[PDB]
């Protein structure tokens, strides 16, 4: 009828009274109905409280694969208003185990794929590694092989990569409704873009000691105004630092800048000369004997 508030009011009183008794299945069911109504109102915070309670409930229960899936469907929706890839990623990780023992590869492979791909939008690549390393995630599965190749591609990125990625894949770039609530096609573009832009700076710092800004604006393929901003936000967060020398249009990534490094680097250098002298000493002595022979 459209009386959202009225249906919720009656559902809220019911579930609370029932709690702690009258079947584990029955109680979890009311909570799914409730979150569905809650999300439309704006009641994301009420939805988070409901989420804590159900999460304990699903754990208690043995034989609860249906219950866990149902919780997942509710959980992703609330994260869509907020924006955490960590919430969705973690509870799905606990669903991985349950999907190997109980279910077919038909249930398991769309979930695996969605989870990694969720992490691809996610702007920091440091989660991504963890999920990819996985023993049955590095061997076989077509989608598995597509994600791992992307994982190598980021390492090497010089950000002429992104349109290559955008065109080449279209499933595994727009695929939803298979272990997640979905997300706009247009939202996938937004996220992917930010993630690459950051990762180009991130590699660029290691590989090259200096780059000029004119070259860098061309590499990202981007306007200076934006580049200055993408860089500015990153350095400020302190995942990395870089420094700009504005009248030169040169970006320093810096280099060693302290005595403490240099003393230890020196004592290393000695340590390598020494080792060479002993390896050379025994090695040469050996050479000698077999000249003899």
């Amino acid at each position: 009828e459209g009386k959202i508030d009225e249906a919720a009011d009656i559902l809220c009183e019911l579930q609370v009274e029932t709690y702690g008794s009258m079947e584990m299945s029955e109680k979890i069911q009311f909570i799914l109905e409730q979150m569905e109504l809650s999300i439309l109102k704006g009641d994301y915070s009420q939805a988070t409280v409901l989420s804590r309670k159900i999460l304990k409930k699903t754990f208690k229960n043995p034989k609860y694969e249906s219950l866990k899936l149902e919780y997942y469907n509710l959980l992703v929706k609330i994260s869509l208003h907020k924006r955490e890839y960590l919430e969705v990623a973690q509870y799905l990780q606990e669903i991985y185990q349950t999907d190997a023992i109980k279910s077919d590869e038909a249930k398991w492979k769309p979930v695996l794929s969605h989870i990694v791909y969720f992490l691809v939008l996610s702007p920091y690549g440091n989660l991504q590694n963890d999920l990819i390393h996985k023993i049955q995630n590095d061997n076989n599965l077509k989608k598995l092989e597509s994600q791992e190749s992307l994982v190598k591609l980021f390492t090497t990125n010089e950000l002429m990569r992104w349109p290559i990625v955008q065109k080449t894949y279209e499933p595994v770039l727009n695929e939803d409704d298979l272990a997640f609530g979905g997300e706009a096609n247009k939202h996938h573009w937004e996220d992917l873009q930010k993630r690459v832009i950051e990762h180009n700076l991130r590699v660029i710092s290691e590989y090259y000691s200096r780059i000029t800004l004119l070259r860098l604006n061309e590499l990202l393929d981007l306007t200076e105004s934006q580049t200055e901003t993408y860089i500015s936000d990153l350095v400020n967060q302190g995942i990395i630092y870089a420094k700009v020398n504005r009248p030169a249009k040169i970006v320093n990534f810096e280099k060693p800048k302290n005595s403490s490094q240099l003393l230890n680097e020196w004592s290393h250098n000695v340590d390598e000369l020494l080792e060479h002298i002993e390896t050379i000493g025994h090695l040469i002595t050996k050479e000698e004997i077999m000249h003899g022979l």
Binding site: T156, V203, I211, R215
Partner: protein, 387 residues
Amino acid sequence: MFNNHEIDTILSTLRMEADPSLHPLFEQFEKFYEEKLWFQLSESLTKFFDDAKSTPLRLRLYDNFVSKFYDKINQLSVVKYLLASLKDSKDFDESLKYLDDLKAQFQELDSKKQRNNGSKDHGDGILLIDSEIARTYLLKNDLVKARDLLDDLEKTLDKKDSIPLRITNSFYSTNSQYFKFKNDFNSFYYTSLLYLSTLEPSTSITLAERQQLAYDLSISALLGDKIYNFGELLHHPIMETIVNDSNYDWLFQLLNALTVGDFDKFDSLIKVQISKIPILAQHESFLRQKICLMTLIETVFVKNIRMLSFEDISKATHLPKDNVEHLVMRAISLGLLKGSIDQVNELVTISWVQPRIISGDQITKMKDRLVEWNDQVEKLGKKMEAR
């Protein structure tokens, strides 16, 4: 010719008296299969020179001679030959049928006597099934099925002492085949090198096997690299009496091609289609940087210092100004470098740390460097000594 009946029968008699062991329908039957200049057996020690050299429909008869062979000779010979002979003979359907026959038992338990692996020695009963199920299954069927067979082949390698070596042979040949089966000429180049390395110094070889390995190495070495494209194949047997067949001219053609960097030369290196792969389409840039890097590394400063002109890297590699920018960009990613090239200052200032090619101009360079390292030390010493 008489030589199969002659050699088998006399040696068969010599190493046990007669007792159901002579076999005149064996003697005639093998006689029928191979009386050319190749023979189907040559008994006992002779089984290390003649054993099946054509499709061996004598097989059911030989199962009753495996059931005599142990007391006509030894341990090793039985496990050594009869699995490989079907495989070389291209008797794939037949190989499977014999693996059902043998399965895992040929004298185990309180028969005692230490067990090795097949295709060299008397094996692991289980290890024959495991190794050859992978060898056969790969040829037949898909890559996803192959990854799964390799994981089992890996379990069996791990689960043993390394002592008979035969099992390790099984691992390299098995594993090499997956990289052939896909596209992975670089991964295959590493695996083929290992396969040859633990094949040659212990013998046990077969003209069929060394034909695959030398030709397979030649295709893989063009098809992918990481170290350098031909210096390593001059400390790296490509035709040093492994076999010279199948036009090993290509190796020498490659070094000339690598230096000039002509497209015409790339087609005339091997033959058109097999030069391209499609492997070489990604490959030419990687291969390209390899020739440039080595040539400069020896030449520019006798000491070896990490100073290069950007210009002289372009001039030497023979590529345009943007292109080299992209190629170097990939090259730092690949490592064996680090220390931080400044892409403004036009200073290729990356640290010295890579391996140096061959025993030739390594030695020239070492003498110069030695006189200098020594001289430096001697000055310090002298001054200290005096006061």
